[PDB]
């Protein structure tokens, strides 16, 4: 029965784990918002081959995923879960946590995202040949940007994105439910102190994160059927294990 002190300590613990694994400093992301790819540079990206652009994006996503893996390893309660469940939670949740974290790198004012040193629009990614998915991802980042999460709120929310007791294949669901509930108390407690409980009703609906993840897997399938050798030769093995069917 998590006491008030234990809940307060859980808040601090979650925020600490996030701060140590957040990948890019927010201050750096925000100061870079003025650095936007030129028309010429956008053209260059649009002229890249499908394979090269996927390969680059696959590498960048894997880098982000590695930070989320570390976040999980440092998240209190997570390493205490059975190994099977650790894997189930990360395989389903890693991409979902990156998608949420990404809103930090998204500028709602001009609909650009930080990518390879500058900010660019969704048309930057045209060579991928998955523009509906990219458009849906930008839309998602835009919806989250309207909540204006603090770093601590991202920490606590992404903890719950990961520690999701409804994932299929959990062998010890009760232990996940219990950690999930304690994380919810931590989240609610922090929001109550900051008068931000209103955001709970405005969080991404049921199935949204699942849809973006499923589409990513589907679009990878389409690419991999068209370019099988590239995926085998050049894609990060972790990316293949998480997403290749």
């Amino acid at each position: 029965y998590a006491s008030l002190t234990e809940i307060e300590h859980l808040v601090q613990s979650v925020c600490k784990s996030y701060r140590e694994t957040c990948q890019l400093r927010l201050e750096d992301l925000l100061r870079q918002r003025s650095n936007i790819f030129s028309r010429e540079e956008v053209t260059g990206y649009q002229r890249k081959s499908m394979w090269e652009m996927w390969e680059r994006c696959a590498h960048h996503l894997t880098e982000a995923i590695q930070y989320v893996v570390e976040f999980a390893k440092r998240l209190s309660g997570f390493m205490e879960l059975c190994q099977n469940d650790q894997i189930v939670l990360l395989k389903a949740g890693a991409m979902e946590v990156v998608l949420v974290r990404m809103c930090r790198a998204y500028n709602a004012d001009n609909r650009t995202v930080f990518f390879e040193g500058k900010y660019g629009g969704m048309e930057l990614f045209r060579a991928l040949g998955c523009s509906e998915l990219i458009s849906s991802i930008f839309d998602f980042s835009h919806s989250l940007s309207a909540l204006h999460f603090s770093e601590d709120e991202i920490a606590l929310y992404t903890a719950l994105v990961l520690i999701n007791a409804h994932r299929p294949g959990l062998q010890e669901k009760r232990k996940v439910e219990q950690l999930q509930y304690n994380l919810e108390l931590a989240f609610h407690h922090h929001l109550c102190k900051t008068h931000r409980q209103s955001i709970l009703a405005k969080l991404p609906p049921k199935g949204k994160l699942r849809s973006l993840c499923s589409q990513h897997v589907e679009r990878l399938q389409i690419f991999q059927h068209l370019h099988p050798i590239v995926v085998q030769a050049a894609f990060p093995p972790l990316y293949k294990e998480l997403f290749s069917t």
Binding site: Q66, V69, K73, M79, Q83, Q86, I87, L90, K91, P237, L238, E241, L242
Partner: peptide, 10 residues
């Protein structure tokens, strides 16, 4: 899940 397993060690 060879890779994820390895990442979770230590």
């Amino acid at each position: 899940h060879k890779i994820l397993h390895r990442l979770l060690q230590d």
